[PDB]
Chain length 343, copies 4
């Protein structure tokens, strides 16, 4: 459960959608006027936020903002530009820029700079290769049907379009090769689809792997640091655990694990506190662990564990947990007894 | 060989299909009445099953059912609602809900709960990014062709449809850019398909991996526990073997390994018993192993080994088997001699 | 280079294609008769081969053929059945069965039996789930547009067809949703493609991995056995090398490594012999290794190494080679001196 | 940042594009003449380059070129052939061959020779199976609709085209099965899309993995060698680091890491030198390392580090860095103090 946990992400989305509702031709005066003024108000809310950021050079503990401020700058300045420069009806186009804000929430863009950054001698090379296949296809298609269909295969651009249709396996159905050689050639084109199709995917494979891997220094190094338990484990041991550990922040008054809900892992608390729906309500603070009972005996959730407040939790798999227990029998002993304490 | 192994899975399917046959317009009086009454009978069968579950809070050994009961409840109550409230012909729609039942047999949903559960700060961000890309394309396409085709590109929704067609690589062929800039733009869209296309796939990569991984605590920890052989092996050693071990339940009188069929692995028996088609018919119970002869000597199946009854088997790869043998020479010695025993 | 190495594979192919040339309607008497008679002759050649296999239960080295014989049986009996039963022109359809021969050459079916065999409690579950989504889409699409287009959406199967078109991202262009609800629904359908799309691919990921892995017992256990060099290395060490080692057979008089071609790996000879184009032509037999010079000094191929005859070779990567050298300094010393011998 | 880093790659591309600009039918006298002459000049530039290469058999440090020269030979000779033999307007087709030049800049073709080289006994087998499935569909589709649509399903090649459309999930929309059996069959065809579609992708999975892996002998062995730091680490330790290490060449006067930009890794310098925007400008030569401060304390880039000149850099991830530090506490000590030196 994730309700009110991300206050900033939740509010922006409706504003983003309003841009589309407005952009409809032949709309009545009553709706269009209201919607148009709304963007000005949304723009103003962002404008207010900007002043706080522009004016303020303090963040508290740790933060860095050069690439990020620029995104914010473009987002607010553009709507302003359209409003002032354009007295005309079509300035709503400029309001599209809010699309950029979602870039900020995600892990991938800062990481991508780097994904793109260390593997592009090969990555660009593959895309350039792609341009080549497309061009070759345009040439091959043009030569075969130019006499029969001056209208359809009249020019290279027309043939290239057919390739666009065929190449990504979209196909329109408006243009087809009447001739035998043409269909056989298509058989080769159909096969070339194999190489092309693979391209779309190999790229994401690396970006996503690295993106998850990065959470390891913050969430699995600094975050783990909170749990004193991890101190006895070796550097080599930690990395395996580090890839394994995962993170979320559960909102207050919500339930992390329902009572009796199958429990095949345990949760560690980094920040915030949780409450255990037990004979003796137990509040767990940072560095604490729960649901270990579930692993030691194999039974579901011991108690409904509810995050009293927004709390950051780490989870350990039964496979991983066993590794912890074998490494440190004394620690395993601690979980067994602590578990008794929870129930 | 899987025949009568899953008694519940086999029966539900015909009922599921019948919902579609009924939903055909302009059907004759004779057939439609009969098929319509069938749903009431199937509904009743489920109703009977529900009473057993609702009424009974007892199971056998260990079981947990909160998320699951709700599914069953919705599946039966809805058909009821349609039958009573609606005397009208179109109540067959309500019978669709049986599609929910298949969710229950699979490993994916409870695990998915977790897959979605610990990786969605990034996952949602990706989908949100996607909504944005679709929107940008709608705007871009509309601006270029509005004057030429008021009929086709007259409005954003119309442009958005083209994007739907192009984006997933489906393409209808009823709409196409007539202008040079439009086709060039399509070239970027064609490329943007690369990122989009990857989205569909990255998500499944993690869920499926985790789903197989999960079988490890039950099938590869508790299940292995049955074989006394695994006790010597270290915690570190077990995980590699654990990922490697796989499971099924072979039904009675069926053949697990046809005699002379190639034997490149061995089978371990957790539950049930098996029979070996040899000079001395041998019945193997839980914790027992067979086919080892095949591995020690490299030979095909020693005997037709048939499951006398429904039996749960674990199998070990030749690569993995060697690891077992190297770790414990005495165990390797045992398998060689046991193997003599089987033949 | 692969030319005459696979004699059986080369010959079957032309015959396989001939089935299609014959099937074309309104062909002249002169050509059609000739092609028709050819199948009878090809059938006869296979018939001769069958008698050899049926009559003979001898192999002379080690072999197993129950599942395989059945394929051969069906392939020959069917053409026979059509020839005798049908004096009619359309018996060429029966000749299609030769397509089964290709299954025999490949690694995948015997393995697939097994891939399907230990993972289907989950794989079937996913496919059945897929049927459910398809059905749900048919229902949702039908209800929305039945009044407007009784001709297009008049029935469930008409709607189902649209689903087939949309679902695999094929899209014909003939049918589209005019209504607002329909296009928005399409947005969900567009997203549902994510799950559908990954399905096609997740399955192949497992079979192909396993298929390559399997060559390890034959090629990387028994095959390695030939090289005395591998004897010193530990069971744990061998598996890493075993995944790494790869195999082919290079035909006689051909070049394995053209002289001065880059040499970033070395080759081991299991069967057959090779010749080294050097000051002292050197013939290497089984258990021998070459191109080690290339790794020790980093230089390209030392000499043109050509297989005098059909030879089976294993190759070791530079990363892997270093591991071999670090494990056994004495062995590394041997490769350096042997290398001097080659040059 | 990559600007003037690749001088040869940058210039060739415009020439490649001009081939398409010329090939447009019904163009004016003024433009077509000029563009046509440009190819002759570009051809001449390449001709000039070839003479240097043909004439010169010496490079500098270390090089090889048999397969590569042939590519260059074909590229230059063909345009010449068209120029001399063809006085006619359509000799621009011959200019397409420049597409080959991009093959040279990439990792994949030499590696592909090898990817194709050790795994094609299986890869060809997969494709052959594919050709067969296509044929089976042609036969199946023809038989069902031949009487109803003699014009559409009149012949096998007409049916085969439908298969081309359906199989790659392109679909034109011009041809559809009217009959019930045909649509049901399509459901199986739709599902067969699972296997086919995955084909396009499994191939790239291995080539790409190997392609990145190869950079390890040059970049991660030779690159490792420049840094004296890597000498202490064990052979087993190096491979994990080797896969992890990545490379690029940042051009002169550009910024490697912007000041204050986040610093979650460090950079090692193999060739060239860098300058640190610090109190005491520091120039780092080969074997040197920077950004370690960022890792030791976790803070962003210490100083703007700019490559004074074209410089080749290696980077170490925080997870990997910790491994380095744990293996050699004294080295960790060195980085902490060196880091102080940088700031
Ligand atoms: K399509
Ligand atoms: K189409």
């Amino acid at each position: 459960l994730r309700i009110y946990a991300p206050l900033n992400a939740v509010l922006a989305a409706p504003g983003l959608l309003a841009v589309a509702a407005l952009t409809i031709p032949d709309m009545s005066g009553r709706s269009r006027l209201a919607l148009a003024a709304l963007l000005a108000v949304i723009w103003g809310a962002y404008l207010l936020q900007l002043a706080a950021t522009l004016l303020k050079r303090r963040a508290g503990v740790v933060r860095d903002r050069t690439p990020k401020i620029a995104i914010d700058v473009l987002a607010v300045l553009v709507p302003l530009a359209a409003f002032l420069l354009d007295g005309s009806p079509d300035w709503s186009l400029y309001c599209a820029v809010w699309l950029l804000k979602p870039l900020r929430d995600s892990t991938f863009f800062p990481v991508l700079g780097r994904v793109l950054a260390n593997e592009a001698r090969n990555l660009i090379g593959v895309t350039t290769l792609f341009g080549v296949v497309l061009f070759a296809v345009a040439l091959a298609a043009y030569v075969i049907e130019r006499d029969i269909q001056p209208e359809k295969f009249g020019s290279i651009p027309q043939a290239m379009w057919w390739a666009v249709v065929t190449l990504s396996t979209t196909g329109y159905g408006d243009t087809i090769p009447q001739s035998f050689a043409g269909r056989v050639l298509a058989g080769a084109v159909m096969m070339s689809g194999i190489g092309i199709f693979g391209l779309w995917a190999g790229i994401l494979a690396t970006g996503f792997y690295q993106e998850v891997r990065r959470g390891d220094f913050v969430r699995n190094w600094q975050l783990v640091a909170a749990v004193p338990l991890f101190q006895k484990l070796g550097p080599a041991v930690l990395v395996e655990i580090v890839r394994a550990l995962r993170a979320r922040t559960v909102p207050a008054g919500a339930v992390i694990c329902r009572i009796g809900e199958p429990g095949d892992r345990m949760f560690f608390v980094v920040e915030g506190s949780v409450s255990v729906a037990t004979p003796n309500p137990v509040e767990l603070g940072p560095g604490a662990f729960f649901g270990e009972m579930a692993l030691i005996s194999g039974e579901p959730r011991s108690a409904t564990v509810s995050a009293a407040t927004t709390v950051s939790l780490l989870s350990l798999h039964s496979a991983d947990f066993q590794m912890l227990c074998s490494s440190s029998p004394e620690i395993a002993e601690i979980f067994r007894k602590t578990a008794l304490e929870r129930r």
